[PDB]
Amino acid sequence: MGVTEAQYVAPTNAVESKLAEIWERVLGVSGIGILDNFFQIGGHSLKAMAVAAQVHREYQVELPLKVLFAQPTIKALAQYVATRS
Numbered sequence: 857m858g859v860t861e862a863q864y865v866a867p868t869n870a871v872e873s874k875l876a877e878i879w880e881r882v883l884g885v886s887g888i889g890i891l892d893n894f895f896q897i898g899g900h901s902l903k904a905m906a907v908a909a910q911v912h913r914e915y916q917v918e919l920p921l922k923v924l925f926a927q928p929t930i931k932a933l934a935q936y937v938a939t940r941s
Contacts, residue, residue: 860896863889867930871938875930882906891929898924916941 861880867873867890879897880888888897898904898921908920915937917923927933 860893861886861888863891863893865889868934869938871934872930875933878910879930890931894928897928 865876865887867876872890876888876890879892880886883896896903897907899907904920904924907924908918911920911923912918915923915933917936923933923936927936
């Protein structure tokens, strides 16, 4: 019924914590959870492009919107990038 940030916040490794940091900063300096807000992190604007750039260079799987909405949580994001890579 509202709320943008402070979802839970229980990280794990570098990718987990660092991307949670990157997300909470880039999304608008606030502080989100691992589960994210499962909506806004995808972002139906420049967000998809900016995230795609990161998903290229840092994730190496380079899939805009798909990893953003189908994996709208750093838990699933980490398992996609720091597992099979």
